[PDB]
Amino acid sequence: IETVPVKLKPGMDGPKVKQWPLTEEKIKALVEICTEMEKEGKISKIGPENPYNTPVFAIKKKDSTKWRKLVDFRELNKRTQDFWIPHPAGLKKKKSVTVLDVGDAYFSVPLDEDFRKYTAFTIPSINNETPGIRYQYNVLPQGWKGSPAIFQSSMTKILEPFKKQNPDIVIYQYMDDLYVGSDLEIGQHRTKIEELRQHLLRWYELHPDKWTVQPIVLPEKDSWTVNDIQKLVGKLNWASQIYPGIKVRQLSKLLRGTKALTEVIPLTEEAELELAENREILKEPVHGVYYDPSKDLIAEIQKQGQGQWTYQIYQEPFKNLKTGKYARMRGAHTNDVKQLTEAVQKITTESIVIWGKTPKFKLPIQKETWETWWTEYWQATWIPEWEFVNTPPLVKLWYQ
Amino acid sequence: MVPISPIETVPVKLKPGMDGPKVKQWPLTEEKIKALVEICTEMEKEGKISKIGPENPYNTPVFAIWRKLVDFRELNKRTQDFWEVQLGIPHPAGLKKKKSVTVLDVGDAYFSVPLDEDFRKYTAFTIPSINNETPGIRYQYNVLPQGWKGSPAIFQSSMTKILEPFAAQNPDIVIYQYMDDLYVGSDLEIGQHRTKIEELRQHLLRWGLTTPDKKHQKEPPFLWMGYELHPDKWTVQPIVLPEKDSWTVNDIQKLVGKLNWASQIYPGIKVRQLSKLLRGTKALTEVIPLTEEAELELAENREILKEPVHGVYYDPSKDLIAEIQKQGQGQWTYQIYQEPFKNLKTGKYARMRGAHTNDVKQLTEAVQKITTESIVIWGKTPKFKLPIQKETWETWWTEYWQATWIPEWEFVNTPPLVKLWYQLEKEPIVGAETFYVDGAANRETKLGKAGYVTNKGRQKVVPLTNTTNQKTELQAIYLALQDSGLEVNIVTDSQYALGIIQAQPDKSESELVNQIIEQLIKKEKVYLAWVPAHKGIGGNEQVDKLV
Numbered sequence: 001i002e003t004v005p006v007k008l009k010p011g012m013d014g015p016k017v018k019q020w021p022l023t024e025e026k027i028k029a030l031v032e033i034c035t036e037m038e039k040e041g042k043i044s045k046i047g048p049e050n051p052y053n054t055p056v057f058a059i060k061k062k063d064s065t066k067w068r069k070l071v072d073f074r075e076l077n078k079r080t081q082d083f084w085i086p087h088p089a090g091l092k093k094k095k096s097v098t099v100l101d102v103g104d105a106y107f108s109v110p111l112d113e114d115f116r117k118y119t120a121f122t123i124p125s126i127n128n129e130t131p132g133i134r135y136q137y138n139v140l141p142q143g144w145k146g147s148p149a150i151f152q153s154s155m156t157k158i159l160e161p162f163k164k165q166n167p168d169i170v171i172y173q174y175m176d177d178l179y180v181g182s183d184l185e186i187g188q189h190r191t192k193i194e195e196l197r198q199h200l201l202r203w204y205e206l207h208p209d210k211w212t213v214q215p216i217v218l219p220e221k222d223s224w225t226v227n228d229i230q231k232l233v234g235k236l237n238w239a240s241q242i243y244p245g246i247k248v249r250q251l252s253k254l255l256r257g258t259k260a261l262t263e264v265i266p267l268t269e270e271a272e273l274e275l276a277e278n279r280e281i282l283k284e285p286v287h288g289v290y291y292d293p294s295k296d297l298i299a300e301i302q303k304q305g306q307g308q309w310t311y312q313i314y315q316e317p318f319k320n321l322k323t324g325k326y327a328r329m330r331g332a333h334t335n336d337v338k339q340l341t342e343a344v345q346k347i348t349t350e351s352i353v354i355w356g357k358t359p360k361f362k363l364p365i366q367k368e369t370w371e372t373w374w375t376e377y378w379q380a381t382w383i384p385e386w387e388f389v390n391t392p393p394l395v396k397l398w399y400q
Numbered sequence: 401m402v403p404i405s406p407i408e409t410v411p412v413k414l415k416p417g418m419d420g421p422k423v424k425q426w427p428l429t430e431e432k433i434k435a436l437v438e439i440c441t442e443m444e445k446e447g448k449i450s451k452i453g454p455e456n457p458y459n460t461p462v463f464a465i466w467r468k469l470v471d472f473r474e475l476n477k478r479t480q481d482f483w484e485v486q487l488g489i490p491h492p493a494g495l496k497k498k499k500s501v502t503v504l505d506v507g508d509a510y511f512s513v514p515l516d517e518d519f520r521k522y523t524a525f526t527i528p529s530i531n532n533e534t535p536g537i538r539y540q541y542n543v544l545p546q547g548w549k550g551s552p553a554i555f556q557s558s559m560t561k562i563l564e565p566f567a568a569q570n571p572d573i574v575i576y577q578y579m580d581d582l583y584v585g586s587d588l589e590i591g592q593h594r595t596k597i598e599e600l601r602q603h604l605l606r607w608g609l610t611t612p613d614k615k616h617q618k619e620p621p622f623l624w625m626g627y628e629l630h631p632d633k634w635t636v637q638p639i640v641l642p643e644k645d646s647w648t649v650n651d652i653q654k655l656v657g658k659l660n661w662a663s664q665i666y667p668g669i670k671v672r673q674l675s676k677l678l679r680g681t682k683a684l685t686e687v688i689p690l691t692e693e694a695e696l697e698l699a700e701n702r703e704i705l706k707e708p709v710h711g712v713y714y715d716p717s718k719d720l721i722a723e724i725q726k727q728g729q730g731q732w733t734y735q736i737y738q739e740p741f742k743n744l745k746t747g748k749y750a751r752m753r754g755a756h757t758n759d760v761k762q763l764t765e766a767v768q769k770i771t772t773e774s775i776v777i778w779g780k781t782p783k784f785k786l787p788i789q790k791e792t793w794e795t796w797w798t799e800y801w802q803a804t805w806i807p808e809w810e811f812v813n814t815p816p817l818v819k820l821w822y823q824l825e826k827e828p829i830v831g832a833e834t835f836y837v838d839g840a841a842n843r844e845t846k847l848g849k850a851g852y853v854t855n856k857g858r859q860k861v862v863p864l865t866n867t868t869n870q871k872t873e874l875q876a877i878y879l880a881l882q883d884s885g886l887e888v889n890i891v892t893d894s895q896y897a898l899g900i901i902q903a904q905p906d907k908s909e910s911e912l913v914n915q916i917i918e919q920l921i922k923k924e925k926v927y928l929a930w931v932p933a934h935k936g937i938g939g940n941e942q943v944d945k946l947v
């Protein structure tokens with residue numbers, strides 16, 4: 001009911017990002033949505049004196065047949081002043097966590113006058129026929145980093161009774177999402193979630209406990225071929241960059257000679273001992289692996305085939321903070337890009353739960369393909385940063 | 401007098417921290433001064449400008465050619481940024497046929513859009529007096545000046561706001577705005593069409609804007625931005641390939657401009673060689689000889705540009721189809737159409753700059769380009785006809801290390817067909833010879849050695865002059881491919897060579913890589929295994945090639 005002064009970082013102008021082309025159905029959907037929001041005063045039309053722009057597109061969330069308006073506030077977010085809560089380290093330790101969309105609440109708080117011109121967006125026209133319908137926000141917009149910061153006081157006032165009632169439930173807020181962690185039963189968790197949503201009304205099952213870090217495992221065989229031993233030495237030599245005392249000379253001693261790849265080689269006793277010591281070393285965690293809030297999180301994804309994908313979140317090379325294997329099959333058996341996009345969304349969600357920020361992705365995809373199709377399968381309210389790797393990494397099969 | 405509705409002004413500011421323009425007035429002849437006094441007197445009598453006292457410290461130079469021309473370049477440098485009047489120009493293939501299309505001149509409305517009151521003082525200009533014996537006449541603009549930075553955007557937004565209710569209450573018509581001309585199309589009867597045109601003239605007159613009752617000089621076919629727009633079709637303005645015995649750099653830039661421009665409707669246009677002659681020249685006047693390939697390409701261009709070809713307009717009720725053909729040397733051509741033999745438009749795609757490539761990657765890129773272009777022009781992705789078997793694409797994307805995807809498509813049997821030329825095995829081959837390869841080079845003398853030893857005792861080491869480590873590793877693999885049977889296992893330590901071959905190219909800049917490709921094509925089964933170097937892995941003989 002009272003606007004809080006918001007400004008930009010010193011020396012930075014407002015965002016001026018090109019609106020990318022949209023299909024006719026998404027354009028019409030945005031026309032209906034923005035017409036309704038204009039009737040509700042949440043947005044207002046602007047004139048040509050507003051040179052700033054932020055991209056916009058339309059998606060469809062899970063279990064819904066209604067379109068939703070998605071704004072790519074990445075540039076405005078990085079250009080918006082830094083607002084100033086320590087991240088809950090217990091949210092990732094909880095048994096279950098539920099994600100709620102509390103974006104509508106932001107629309108009840110007006111936006112600072114002089115800042116509104118920085119939220120300008122354009123509904124594009126097909127074939128550049130019309131100049132495009134230009135809008136700016138009058139309330140807190142969903143996707144902007146200032147919306148949760150400004151609404152934080154009101155959110156604390158709304159969640160104060162529920163927090164005082166259940167001190168065993170951890171509540172976190174990131175962007176337009178509310179993460180509610182507990183240790184109850186799935187039925188009790190769903191009834192409690194309905195309790196919280198009806199509590200918020202009058203004013204996504206996720207289980208981190210079924211998630212752990214993945215160790216480097218070595219094969220257990222009774223007979224080893226030359227190729228088997230070569231791959232084992234390769235993987236151990238790769239792991240020696242992460243683990244110090246990895247030793248491979250007794251296993252490479254077996255490869256002496258020019259033998260056929262499919263020839264079985266019996267392991268000497270020194271080779272068995274070396275391999276056992278290497279197993280023991282790999283069973284231990286990595287030495288000196290810490291998280292630094294001042295550094296960026298990097299996520300790497302490898303396509304393993306048959307709907308399987310591997311990923312690693314780290315900050316320094318060979319110092320993995322998280323590793324995982326997303327192999328879920330959800331209506332994307334014939335589309336690599338949809339699978340990759342869902343994987344990026346899940347990894348970003350896990351990163352939000354663990355560290356409270358999104359990582360920078362290294363995607364195994366050509367820039368043009370990804371930039372052409374990723375919005376067709378996006379369903380989250382946030383968007384991470386990403387880059388593209390064009391050289392096939394050798395370590396792929398070492399995470400398989 | 402009928403009350404005229406006022407046009408709301410757009411608040412305009414200068415760039416932050418900057419001040420208005422202050423430029424010295426150009427000295428003018430007596431006749432030019434008289435002409436500018438007459439013109440400015442008439443404009444003042446019409447309300448476009450107003451006289452100002454000496455308190456205004458700003459000034460913009462004025463000229464006459466009469467006709468008054470004001471040089472606002474400094475004020476343009478000092479004026480704020482505006483939203484772009486147009487993000488791009490439409491494409492004729494996106495237009496939808498109309499029974500009637502009328503053109504209305506709203507030029508009289510250009511100088512009838514008021515300027516922001518607080519900004520008018522920055523448009524001040526001075527007419528010099530005769531012999532400069534009196535103070536020059538001081539004027540300022542009250543409407544959007546011609547040549548000012550913000551005039552097109554403010555004019556288009558004002559006209560759009562004016563036309564919004566008329567276009568809303570008349571959905572059965574279509575109104576487009578371009579500069580000082582409106583274009584109104586409809587499928588109504590011609591009488592109803594002229595009626596609604598009169599309604600538009602009245603609605604525009606409710607803001608005091610006058611459309612000429614005179615018949616419009618613009619009539620079909622409309623010539624616009626290198627385009628011919630006819631009542632039922634469109635094409636490019638005629639393209640003439642000149643007959644030149646000697647071709648300079650500017651002649652080839654004009655030829656590749658006419659060919660690139662003509663390629664959007666004329667199918668089969670190629671520009672590889674003619675643009676290749678421009679590689680790293682940076683000299684506009686240099687004459688460059690014409691290669692034989694450029695001569696054959698130019699001849700095929702003259703054969704394609706023999707007789708005129710037209711494109712049809714878009715019909716949203718029919719499906720959108722895009723068909724791709726391979727042309728060689730990284731050249732691809734495509735036609736977008738809805739009915740056979742009747743193209744909406746055509747185009748081409750050239751492969752990107754790369755050391756290695758294959759046809760499937762290029763086809764994928766071309767598909768993405770056509771998809772983006774189609775979403776721009778028609779707002780939907782077309783259904784594709786591609787020269788590639790379904791099983792080929794399935795093998796590729798299922799085995800490719802990168803994520804890839806093309807939208808709905810079907811196979812069309814138009815050679816040359818994109819195919820996978822070789823496929824590496826996933827497991828070692830039983831019964832096949834195992835070639836342990838290696839290569840090495842001296843960094844100073846550039847002397848190296850490449851070779852292999854096999855499980856059957858076969859061996860070879862070849863010495864090489866003027867080579868590198870990477871070159872000797874590739875050469876080693878090539879030797880193993882040369883001297884092996886149809887099925888072969890190959891063991892290397894070169895992360896470089898494995899990185900090249902796992903990218904699956906079918907063509908390369910390096911002749912060595914191309915030779916390796918040609919050897920792989922002849923094989924039945926190839927398994928390529930990698931090992932770490934200098935780890936004492938027997939068979940992998942680093943010392944045999946470092947002698």
Ligand SMILES: C=CC(=O)N(C)c1cc(Oc2ccccc2OCCn2ccc(=O)[nH]c2=O)c(C)c2cc(C#N)ccc12
Binds near residue numbers: 574583
């Ligand atoms: C703002 C306009 C614009 O951007 N562009 C591309 C334009 C569209 C445009 O045509 C239509 C204007 C109204 C509705 C539909 C239009 O097209 C339908 C197809 N079409 C085309 C021609 C025809 O005779 N019959 C027909 O059915 C015309 C006639 C233009 C003419 C000039 C000139 N000088 C310049 C631009 C033009």
